[PDB]
Write a protein that binds this ligand. Structure first.
Ligand SMILES: Cc1cc(OCCCc2c(C(=O)Nc3cccc(C(=O)O)c3)[nH]c3c(-c4c(C)nn(C)c4C)c(Cl)ccc23)cc(C)c1Cl
Length: 151
Protein backbone atom coordinates (compact mmCIF):
# COMPACT_ATOMS: atom_id res chain seq x y z
CA UNK A 1 0.00 0.00 0.00
CA UNK A 2 3.10 2.18 0.52
CA UNK A 3 4.68 3.17 -2.80
CA UNK A 4 7.66 5.31 -1.70
CA UNK A 5 8.82 2.70 0.78
CA UNK A 6 8.61 -0.08 -1.83
CA UNK A 7 10.51 1.95 -4.46
CA UNK A 8 13.10 2.88 -1.84
CA UNK A 9 13.57 -0.72 -0.77
CA UNK A 10 14.00 -1.79 -4.37
CA UNK A 11 16.72 0.85 -4.91
CA UNK A 12 18.52 0.30 -1.57
CA UNK A 13 18.19 -3.50 -1.69
CA UNK A 14 19.75 -3.60 -5.14
CA UNK A 15 22.58 -1.20 -4.37
CA UNK A 16 23.58 -3.24 -1.32
CA UNK A 17 23.19 -6.73 -2.85
CA UNK A 18 25.02 -5.68 -5.99
CA UNK A 19 27.77 -4.10 -3.88
CA UNK A 20 28.28 -7.15 -1.67
CA UNK A 21 28.43 -9.43 -4.72
CA UNK A 22 29.57 -9.04 -8.29
CA UNK A 23 26.55 -8.47 -10.47
CA UNK A 24 23.38 -6.52 -10.92
CA UNK A 25 19.89 -7.80 -10.32
CA UNK A 26 18.46 -8.41 -13.82
CA UNK A 27 14.85 -8.46 -12.66
CA UNK A 28 12.72 -5.80 -14.40
CA UNK A 29 11.95 -2.92 -12.09
CA UNK A 30 8.59 -2.05 -10.60
CA UNK A 31 6.67 1.21 -10.86
CA UNK A 32 8.81 4.32 -11.49
CA UNK A 33 11.72 2.18 -12.65
CA UNK A 34 13.43 4.68 -14.96
CA UNK A 35 13.95 6.82 -11.90
CA UNK A 36 15.00 3.74 -9.94
CA UNK A 37 17.52 2.74 -12.59
CA UNK A 38 18.84 6.33 -12.57
CA UNK A 39 18.94 6.64 -8.75
CA UNK A 40 20.75 3.32 -8.77
CA UNK A 41 23.36 4.65 -11.21
CA UNK A 42 23.72 7.69 -8.92
CA UNK A 43 24.23 5.50 -5.90
CA UNK A 44 26.97 3.68 -7.79
CA UNK A 45 28.84 6.79 -8.81
CA UNK A 46 28.48 8.74 -5.53
CA UNK A 47 28.12 5.79 -3.15
CA UNK A 48 31.52 4.42 -4.10
CA UNK A 49 33.09 7.86 -3.67
CA UNK A 50 31.62 8.15 -0.17
CA UNK A 51 32.76 4.62 0.74
CA UNK A 52 36.37 5.18 -0.37
CA UNK A 53 36.48 8.63 1.26
CA UNK A 54 35.26 7.34 4.66
CA UNK A 55 36.81 3.84 4.78
CA UNK A 56 38.60 4.18 8.14
CA UNK A 57 35.46 5.37 9.96
CA UNK A 58 33.41 2.66 8.22
CA UNK A 59 35.97 0.02 9.18
CA UNK A 60 35.92 1.26 12.76
CA UNK A 61 32.15 1.27 13.05
CA UNK A 62 31.74 -2.02 11.21
CA UNK A 63 34.35 -3.63 13.44
CA UNK A 64 32.76 -2.49 16.70
CA UNK A 65 29.38 -3.67 15.47
CA UNK A 66 30.57 -7.31 15.64
CA UNK A 67 27.84 -8.70 13.40
CA UNK A 68 27.40 -12.48 13.53
CA UNK A 69 23.84 -13.44 12.59
CA UNK A 70 20.56 -12.06 11.28
CA UNK A 71 19.33 -11.38 14.82
CA UNK A 72 22.24 -8.94 15.11
CA UNK A 73 20.80 -6.91 12.20
CA UNK A 74 18.07 -5.34 14.31
CA UNK A 75 20.06 -4.35 17.27
CA UNK A 76 22.24 -2.63 14.67
CA UNK A 77 19.26 -0.47 13.78
CA UNK A 78 19.64 1.23 17.15
CA UNK A 79 23.12 2.56 16.49
CA UNK A 80 22.16 3.72 12.97
CA UNK A 81 18.99 5.46 14.17
CA UNK A 82 21.10 7.07 16.89
CA UNK A 83 23.62 8.32 14.30
CA UNK A 84 21.26 9.33 11.50
CA UNK A 85 17.99 10.81 12.72
CA UNK A 86 18.63 13.71 15.10
CA UNK A 87 20.70 16.19 13.04
CA UNK A 88 20.30 17.94 9.70
CA UNK A 89 18.35 16.29 6.87
CA UNK A 90 19.86 16.59 3.39
CA UNK A 91 20.74 14.40 0.42
CA UNK A 92 24.41 13.97 1.37
CA UNK A 93 23.53 12.45 4.75
CA UNK A 94 21.00 10.02 3.20
CA UNK A 95 23.59 8.94 0.63
CA UNK A 96 26.06 8.34 3.48
CA UNK A 97 23.39 6.21 5.16
CA UNK A 98 22.94 4.04 2.07
CA UNK A 99 26.72 3.86 1.40
CA UNK A 100 27.50 2.50 4.84
CA UNK A 101 24.68 0.04 4.21
CA UNK A 102 26.66 -1.11 1.20
CA UNK A 103 29.83 -1.33 3.34
CA UNK A 104 28.19 -3.58 5.97
CA UNK A 105 26.57 -5.63 3.18
CA UNK A 106 29.97 -6.37 1.62
CA UNK A 107 31.26 -7.42 5.02
CA UNK A 108 28.28 -9.72 5.47
CA UNK A 109 28.97 -11.38 2.15
CA UNK A 110 32.51 -12.02 3.38
CA UNK A 111 31.39 -13.75 6.62
CA UNK A 112 28.98 -15.92 4.57
CA UNK A 113 25.77 -14.22 5.76
CA UNK A 114 24.39 -12.80 2.51
CA UNK A 115 20.94 -13.82 3.76
CA UNK A 116 21.23 -10.84 6.12
CA UNK A 117 21.69 -8.30 3.34
CA UNK A 118 17.99 -8.09 2.70
CA UNK A 119 16.87 -7.48 6.32
CA UNK A 120 19.56 -4.82 6.52
CA UNK A 121 18.14 -3.09 3.41
CA UNK A 122 14.65 -3.29 4.83
CA UNK A 123 15.75 -1.70 8.10
CA UNK A 124 17.63 1.03 6.25
CA UNK A 125 14.62 1.70 4.01
CA UNK A 126 12.28 1.67 6.98
CA UNK A 127 14.42 4.13 8.92
CA UNK A 128 14.74 6.53 6.02
CA UNK A 129 11.13 6.59 4.84
CA UNK A 130 9.65 6.67 8.35
CA UNK A 131 11.63 9.53 9.99
CA UNK A 132 12.08 11.54 6.73
CA UNK A 133 8.86 11.01 4.74
CA UNK A 134 7.67 14.64 4.74
CA UNK A 135 11.10 15.80 3.63
CA UNK A 136 11.25 13.10 0.94
CA UNK A 137 7.85 14.13 -0.35
CA UNK A 138 8.62 17.83 -0.56
CA UNK A 139 12.02 17.21 -2.19
CA UNK A 140 10.33 14.94 -4.77
CA UNK A 141 11.78 11.66 -3.52
CA UNK A 142 14.10 9.79 -5.82
CA UNK A 143 13.65 12.16 -8.76
CA UNK A 144 14.93 14.88 -6.47
CA UNK A 145 17.73 12.56 -5.40
CA UNK A 146 18.85 12.00 -9.00
CA UNK A 147 18.53 15.67 -9.97
CA UNK A 148 20.56 16.72 -6.93
CA UNK A 149 23.54 14.51 -7.80
CA UNK A 150 23.29 14.98 -11.55
CA UNK A 151 26.36 15.57 -13.72
C1 LIG B 1 23.80 0.90 7.73
C2 LIG B 1 24.13 1.97 8.76
C3 LIG B 1 23.92 3.34 8.54
C4 LIG B 1 24.28 4.22 9.60
O1 LIG B 1 24.12 5.66 9.59
C5 LIG B 1 24.29 6.46 8.45
C6 LIG B 1 24.09 7.87 8.97
C7 LIG B 1 25.20 8.57 8.14
C8 LIG B 1 26.54 8.58 8.87
C9 LIG B 1 27.11 9.70 9.40
C10 LIG B 1 26.50 11.07 9.44
O2 LIG B 1 25.34 11.12 9.69
N1 LIG B 1 27.29 12.24 9.27
C11 LIG B 1 26.72 13.58 9.37
C12 LIG B 1 26.79 14.52 8.35
C13 LIG B 1 26.23 15.78 8.56
C14 LIG B 1 25.62 16.09 9.78
C15 LIG B 1 25.56 15.15 10.80
C16 LIG B 1 24.89 15.46 12.15
O3 LIG B 1 25.24 14.86 13.20
O4 LIG B 1 23.96 16.34 12.20
C17 LIG B 1 26.12 13.90 10.59
N2 LIG B 1 28.27 9.39 9.96
C18 LIG B 1 28.54 8.10 9.81
C19 LIG B 1 29.65 7.36 10.24
C20 LIG B 1 30.80 8.12 10.99
C21 LIG B 1 31.84 8.89 10.43
C22 LIG B 1 32.09 9.18 8.98
N3 LIG B 1 32.58 9.33 11.40
N4 LIG B 1 32.12 8.92 12.55
C23 LIG B 1 32.68 9.21 13.86
C24 LIG B 1 31.04 8.18 12.38
C25 LIG B 1 30.24 7.53 13.51
C26 LIG B 1 29.71 5.99 9.96
CL1 LIG B 1 31.07 4.96 10.45
C27 LIG B 1 28.68 5.38 9.27
C28 LIG B 1 27.57 6.14 8.86
C29 LIG B 1 27.49 7.51 9.12
C30 LIG B 1 24.80 3.72 10.80
C31 LIG B 1 24.98 2.38 11.00
C32 LIG B 1 25.57 1.85 12.32
C33 LIG B 1 24.64 1.50 9.97
CL2 LIG B 1 24.88 -0.22 10.22
Amino acid sequence: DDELYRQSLEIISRYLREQATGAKDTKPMGRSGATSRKALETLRRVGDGVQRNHETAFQGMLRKLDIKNEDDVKSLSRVMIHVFSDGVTNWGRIVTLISFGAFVAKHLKTINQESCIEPLAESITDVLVRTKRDWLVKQRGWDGFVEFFHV
